[PDB]
């Protein structure tokens, strides 16, 4: 900085304190009063959703091994079980209502060939509508789901 | 060019911190933004430039 | 007849009553269409 | 009945579920600290888990981001709730949780912290609720318009077949203006430069230049210890080179005093505009209120304007009582069977309503979608009854 | 829950209730013939 | 640094006349913050493409790029997809070789969040705590008594 | 430059929206060529010249 | 004027952080040469259209440019569609009137 | 051509027909790279490579 | 390698592709020629 008159060196750590600080203190994270700092990731208005924090996952998978002592990752607020559960409680109510069809379909139709026609005319017509919006543009969406059920 | 340099100088909106910043101290109960330099309004104001 | 005159969505209540009807009206046609190539074939081919 | 059992039941647009996944904001009052709301996210963390170990699996505190915007008074706790087999009960979902936690944070607090469902909905279009804006239109400044909307919040409380309404979040709090006597300044053989990049490269912070660690280039930073830059008798300590090689205090130049100015102006559409989320009447449904609060807004002063199932179903059902006929007769050609599957409509329907009505069921979106299809088995049925007997 | 609901309730009542009771046949009836 | 009334004016004011002639719209918003941060929103037609969109805002923004105070220039100016809602928020905390909440935060934004914002249609990344930066702590009295400034 | 053709000096606040700060001369001083001998400017030697 | 090093933390570097929120992408690469010149790579997913594909990659680094040096400002800075390969490349000579 | 360039110069000289397929997928060939992906620098890469 | 060091990079194509080539083929050759004889032929 300086250099007083008789030749006394003013030096940056003479006038002020020199740390490696954050470039924000504004926030601080603390994962159940534990220290820590995560990343929250918001969407790109039309983006794929659970396609992407897939690949969330990915990108992040070749980071975890190079990581230095004690430094783990935890998973709090996450969408993704959430759509693994309504597929699976949706595809449960599919098959529940194939197998009730069937034995309503026995107590009439005693003839077990009979029992079978229909058994077997609605897995195709379901397999037509992922053939059919996919085609139109449609997802495996919350809505087009409930759609095959209905 | 003096002018210039007044109107470059005086009519300005200048970014000055706050009280209880970024990196505060452990204790403080208060947090302030500061107001410095102002960018003029009126004619009468410019009228006043030293 | 009921289904896409409903399915003429609106807003934010777009992909919502439009995927409504279209899903299953797909789904209509697919389920005539079975009935008129193949819940008819294997009927005839084999009921009783 | 049937139209009765319609009418009356509420319009949802989609029901709000459990998700295994909340969250909770904080606000503390006026100019508070980055130290006095860590002691409240303390707290919230607590009722977390202590009182709430078979509900919550892990937290994650965050002090001072508020989905408001940001700053030392607000706040957020994320929830992450345990899996949905060991979380059984009616209060071990989301519905319960978010309701004595809510009862808790009014009780043994002195600020304002919430919690709620994740609207698993859309931010927008909650149905039965608001969102009203106050644009300042002509000349006015920033001071009329608060003026404006504490008359506005006050007209719809002072008389609400009711309405619940409240500000955004411009606080409005107080600031440390410093006045530069300019003339002093040059007396004393300042630049105003010089002075200027002191107060804000001392109590703000100035990005300087950019510096390499460990590879990746990040930015160099200068301030000033905490200490100097807490209250408005440190100022005092700053002293600036004058163009005479020799030092001058702020105190010589400057002025101290405060300010009641507001720490968030918001601008809607090109002009300043404070917004006002309020909600319908727990009897009334948007379209009364929001016709109800143009009129309030409209008796306001002078250069103050103002800028905000669905009504979908009605057109939309309107083609559904067109093409039904057309279809009816496409195979059916009489004008006697174009008014016999008519009837199987209400037949079904009824019970549709009756079904909802008795369980804590609404009228959302699966439901206006269970009617269409209720009404096309309504017609098959019939269509047979019919075809047949032809 | 908020799809069956509505169904069931629609459905329950337009079977029991169309082919039997009300109309469904009661239509057909003063429609086709009644005066044409 | 700069507060309230300061950015509404400099920064906010300045983009808000040079943000005209773009394709579908209905209106704009602002948030102009005491902490010395705006954000603009516009918000467009339904089915209008995000993609497009973009482009337009953020090349008519970078008009009134030049009519800006300095410090703002250098500092981060962003346009991207906005989706009021996170997903995945990855936390990560330390157990044995133990770290600050801001030695994380630093390591954090210095190894992953750089890929993830890329990554699979991410709008945009949000950090807690801060990267890391040469922090100084400059004494009063210090540069006094050599007669200095800032 | 800035007497007669005009200079974008800075902006300035006017009932809300920013607008521009320009500086000129007034018009007379500038409306045939006898005019520029007006113009003094300041020599490092603290003296006017034309 | 700037060699490997410089050119390699002061333009790429620079760019390199502020290098994302992109939509289709596998990778980036660079080469920061000693001559004093970064020429950045971004391939993206096959199909994708390269009319939007430049814009966001230009539209980001364009936040990252008053985060440079001066001289590399007025400098040339590209963003363009690569095809390494040429072909047509037309050689301009001179017989009568001769030049250099 | 490559044999002659080998054999009366002293530095590195190839060619070779144009891929007339794309610049990638030779079959039966390579592109790997070395990433250095904690706090080391070019130095410490190098003798990685090596 | 030592630590902090990492790395990054007909077709498998046909095996998949031609497994629909092996379906296609089936049904087509018993949309004309229904028995489950010429289907084999
Ligand atoms: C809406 C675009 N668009 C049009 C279209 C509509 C109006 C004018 C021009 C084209 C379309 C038109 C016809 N005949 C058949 C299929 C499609 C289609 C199919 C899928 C999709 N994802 C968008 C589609």
Known sequence: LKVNQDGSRVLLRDVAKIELGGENYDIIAEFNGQPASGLGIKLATGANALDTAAAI?????????????????????????????????????????????????????????????????????????????????????????????? | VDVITAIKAQ??????????????????????????????????EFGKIL | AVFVPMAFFGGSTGAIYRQFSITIVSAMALSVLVALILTPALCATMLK | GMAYLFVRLPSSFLPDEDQGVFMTMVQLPAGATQERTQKVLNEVTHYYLT????????????????????????????????????????????EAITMRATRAFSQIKDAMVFAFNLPAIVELGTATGFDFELIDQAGLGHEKLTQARNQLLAEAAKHPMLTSVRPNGLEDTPQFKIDIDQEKAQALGVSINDINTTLGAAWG??????????????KVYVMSE?????????????????????????????????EYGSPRLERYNGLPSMEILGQAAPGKSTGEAMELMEQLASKLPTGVGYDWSGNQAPSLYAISLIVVFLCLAALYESWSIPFSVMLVVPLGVIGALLAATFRGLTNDVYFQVGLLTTIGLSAKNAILIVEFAK | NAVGTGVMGGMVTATVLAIFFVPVFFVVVRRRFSRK | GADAKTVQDTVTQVIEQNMNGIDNLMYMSSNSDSTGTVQITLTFESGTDADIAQVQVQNKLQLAMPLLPQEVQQQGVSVEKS??????????????????????????????????????????????????????????????????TP
């Open chain 4, 51 to 94: 009182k709430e170990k078979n509900n919550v699996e892990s937290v994650f505190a965050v002090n001072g981001f508020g989905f408001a915007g940001r700053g030392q008074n607000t706040g957020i706790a994320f929830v992450s709730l345990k899996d949905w087999a060991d979380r059984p009960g009616e209060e071990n979902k989301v």
């Open chain 4, 226 to 258: 905490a200490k100097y830059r807490m209250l408005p008798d440190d100022i005092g300590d700053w002293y600036v080179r004058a163009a005479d090689g020799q030092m001058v205090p702020f105190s010589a130049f400057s002025s101290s005093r405060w």
């Open chain 4, 205 to 218: 912070g100035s990005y300087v230049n950019d510096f390499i660690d460990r590879g990746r280039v990040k």
């Open chain 6, 83 to 148: 989706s009021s809602s996170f997903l995945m928020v990855v936390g990560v905390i330390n157990t044995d070789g133990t770290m600050t909440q801001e030695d994380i935060s630093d390591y954090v934004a210095a190894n992953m969040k750089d890929a993830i914002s890329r990554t699979s249609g991410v709008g945009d990344v949000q950090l807690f705590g801060s990267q890391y930066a040469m922090r100084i702590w400059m004494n009063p009295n210090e540069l006094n008594k050599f007669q200095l």
């Open chain 1, 57 to 150: 996952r990915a990108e992040l998978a070749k980071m975890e091994p190079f990581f230095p002592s004690g430094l783990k990752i935890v998973y709090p607020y996450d969408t993704t079980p959430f759509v693994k559960i309504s597929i699976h409680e949706v595809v449960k109510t599919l098959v529940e209502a194939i197998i009730l069809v069937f034995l309503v379909m026995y107590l009439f139709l005693q003839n077990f060939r009979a029992t079978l026609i229909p058994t077997i005319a609605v897995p195709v017509v379901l397999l037509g509508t992922f053939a059919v919006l996919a085609a139109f543009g449609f997802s495996i969406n919350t809505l087009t789901m409930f759609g095959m059920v209905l």
């Open chain 2, 11 to 44: 009519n300005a909106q200048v970014a000055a911190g706050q009280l209880g910043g970024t990196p505060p101290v452990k204790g403080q109960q208060l947090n302030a933004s500061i107001i410095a330099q102002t960018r003029l309004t009126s004619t009468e």
